[PDB]
Design a protein around this ligand. Structure first.
Ligand code: HEM
Ligand code: HEM
Ligand code: HEM
Ligand code: BA
Ligand code: BA
Ligand code: CL
Ligand code: CL
Ligand code: FE2
Ligand code: FE2
Ligand code: FE2
Ligand code: FE2
Ligand code: FE2
Ligand code: FE2
Ligand code: FE2
Lengths: 154, 154, 155, 155, 154, 154, 154
């Protein structure tokens, strides 16, 4: 079918964000395993997998709209050097992606690509849940203290 | 059946206590989830459910005695801003409810409404169990220290 | 996350509506059990439980947006004195709540809080199902006659 | 195979009758659900499904005889405004369809299309069962009274 | 409930589209069986059933909004005389229905009938899935050649 | 542990090759689904997943050797415009990766990183199996003819 | 079969390393149980069992090559007096064994005893896994602090 060109552009922009998040979260996950914080690492690994599923949905939609999915580009990965930075890096990445998705929904609405809007709404819901999780973890560090927070992730 | 009007007044007073506790404990439960203290949040959620079952028993008894249950009124909720205050707010609320129930029992005994007395005895037992639980949590915070206590609630 | 303050005010307005409905329908459900209309009482009880679930969803959303859920306030309960009035009281309550949710959806859309719009959409759908059920019960009373309607609610 | 053109015209006439009935009974079934008479609505829905099966059999037979099935045309639906009229509308529709099928059987016999006669015989039998059911419902309304009849259709 | 009269008009317009598609796809399904292309016939039969379920949802919504569903009218059926034409006729029909649904969504949004909008969004999604399927079959015919395509449908 | 710096460099070079292959094969897989060649698309999808597993093993080894895995870089994706080109693109990518892996093994051997050598040997075995598969598919096209080959992939 | 005398010498050198590790890790395991650090004790016990299986494989290979396995000799055990020292003593022992195995591999390659080489490769892999585990425990002690680390081992 012939999709709106700007909708395909938003699908490819959010795809670049998802590919960036797959790699960041995958790297962070294996880094947490390497550090011996496997409980947090497992949660991080599942977030990487969730971004792979988002990327897969975007790619399928782009083909349906007759566009070419862009798997070539990546944003700069935000890599933490300890657990508090790791969480803040992931938070910054999801906050940036949230903005793309919110603008994509308003665009889909305006060009009456209402099925692409429902894909982006699903993504936005998952993105806010992940932001809420990250904000909670960063606040827990301060309340339980870093050493206890790290102990709980072993 | 025509119940004693002052027994029905005590049943409605305690129903107001129970509705206030449903709401305080439900709000506290969801606040604890929001803070990432899910273990304590799950327990607080079960206390809210316990108060809904007390309210249900009071409402059933009031109808049976030809009264109208009062679901309109609520006491001021005691909302904590952190875990220590949350526990102290629940304790204060249960101590106030315990005083109403002890008074209601003495009154049901004096007017020989012995089945209403048995319902209030069941509530008084559950209330003391909750007060004991709360007083223990408050003492544990001082023994294990607040950072450990909160770590254990994640 | 920092939610829009007017979206939070709509989530809180709808939370007061849901809290009112929990209590009206719970009271109505136990009143129906007391009258011996336990079939209708069981359905009314399940509607109260459905409102507790809507309240729970709104409370979670308000915390996520950094707001404080309002469990202190309640609208005036509309309490029926017989089965026809009980159904009419529930219908008036759901019609007023429908008006809030529909306004809240339009506001979420205009400030681009699309996740909060999806919560309100789900509640709107549940609310129209409930309104349809109530309008149907009021019409059935008229078609089968009140004494048959009540007979059918006995168990 | 080359079927008799007048047999194909009867298969198509009966197909229009079945298509009309699918739609009348589907609409009636959903109308009964909307009114809260779900027991009668479920039975009406199963009659609509039964007509879809008859339509399917006629369409297959028409293709086998090298004809083209007519799904474009429909008779005027007879839509009731209440339960007594709904049943009377269904009865009028089945009585008119009975007349077509009975004529079609006589024609199949006279041109020795005996397989098409057996399809029409099966439909005739189903149609008389449906007519008997409808006449019985109309008589029950009179014997138990409309308010009891409707009560019994609530669920 | 009293629905918007123009929303009910869109629900009835789409109901006419769906009834036309039930019949076109059922006829095409049985024609494919008659031709010995049972695999494609089974798929076309399932698309007809899918349109009956869409029609059922529209009828239920119209009653709920105090309208009368229109099962009297049908559009002209687009009947193919071979497999390539059959697929092109279904595609043309779904493209026309897609235009009605997109218009109905924009209208339900403008008048704030947001539950009717959600029903039309579900239909629009199913419709694009079917259009994608049809456009793919038409492209496969040119890639594998018509004789192979038909062989695969036996 | 302190890994040889050039071993880590080879692990990161083969990681870039694996990330390139994940994306190429994932894109090719969903493109084959879009074209209606799902049997080939499923096989392509499983090759993408196999490259994800290779990438995961490389990343874990790099952390163990105290290096930082590079998920930022990608080679130019070789994207086909039809099935014969798709297969030739995948073949060219695996032939290029084969050279990196063969040089990595000789390097690991020379610096006595014998455990990294065994990882690269496993990769080389999987790479040759995939090359053999691709060479076979390209020869089958010529023997059965393209239209039959495509028909068999539907 | 007549094995190379220097290969048999390496098999016996590594057998001495393995016997020393069986005993060091078994003693450390039972010391950890004695101290009440059962979780860490269970892991240390499984490492001792792993070294018994390595010793068993070396003994079998030596017999096969017509040598006599040396179970008479042991290196000096490195015994810790607390948990941090215990971990550092195991790490030192595994680092020394890793050096013998890397040398033995290079020698088996040079004299073309390729089956003995494959046995030493298996041991080298298991050894690096244990070294990585130990280096991680030592880093966790500094991140979570010694009191938390020990708490987690109870
Ligand atoms: C184009 C980017 C990618 C896409 C679309 C993608 C897609 C997928 C999908 C759909 C799954 C299965 C999800 C499920 O059903 O459970 C999966 C699994 C996985 N992916 Fe990815 N992926 C991508 C990139 C990566 C990267 C860059 C890595 C690591 C370097 C990776 C590692 C994994 C792992 C370890 C699994 C688990 C699969 C298994 O063995 O069960 N992926 N991927
Ligand atoms: C009149 C006040 C209320 C009454 C009488 C009431 C009654 C009940 C009862 C009897 C139950 C099931 C008890 C059981 O586990 O067997 C229940 C469940 C529940 N109530 Fe309430 N409730 C009230 C107010 C509330 C409020 C304010 C909330 C706040 C959201 C709430 C949320 C819930 C939830 C989440 C459940 C769990 C539902 C389930 O899965 O079974 N309730 N309520
Ligand atoms: C008002 C138009 C129609 C409506 C609303 C309708 C509705 C339905 C529904 C809801 C089903 C079952 C859906 C499911 O699988 O769960 C069904 C089944 C079926 N319909 Fe229709 N239908 C319509 C017209 C037709 C027409 C024109 C035909 C042509 C013969 C037809 C033939 C069938 C057949 C063969 C089945 C399968 C029955 C079974 O085994 O369950 N329908 N219909
Ligand atoms: Ba601790
Ligand atoms: Ba009766
Ligand atoms: Cl702990
Ligand atoms: Cl009865
Ligand atoms: Fe995502
Ligand atoms: Fe209580
Ligand atoms: Fe609600
Ligand atoms: Fe029929
Ligand atoms: Fe449809
Ligand atoms: Fe690979
Ligand atoms: Fe060993």
């Amino acid at each position: 079918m012939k999709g709106d060109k700007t909708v395909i552009q938003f699908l490819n922009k959010q795809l670049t964000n998802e590919l960036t998040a797959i790699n960041q979260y995958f790297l962070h996950a294996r880094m947490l395993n390497h550090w011996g914080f496997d409980k947090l690492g497992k949660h991080e690994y599942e977030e990487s997998i969730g971004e792979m599923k988002h990327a897969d949905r975007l790619i399928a939609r782009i083909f349906m709209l007759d566009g070419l999915p862009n798997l070539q580009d990546l944003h700069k990965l935000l890599i933490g050097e300890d657990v508090p930075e790791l969480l803040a890096c992931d938070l910054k990445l999801e906050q940036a992606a949230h903005a793309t998705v919110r603008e994509a929904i308003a665009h889909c609405e305006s060009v009456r690509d209402y099925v692409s809007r429902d894909l982006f709404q699903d993504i936005l819901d998952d993105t806010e849940e992940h932001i809420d999780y990250l904000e909670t973890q960063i606040d827990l560090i301060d309340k339980v203290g870093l050493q206890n927070y790290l102990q709980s992730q072993m």
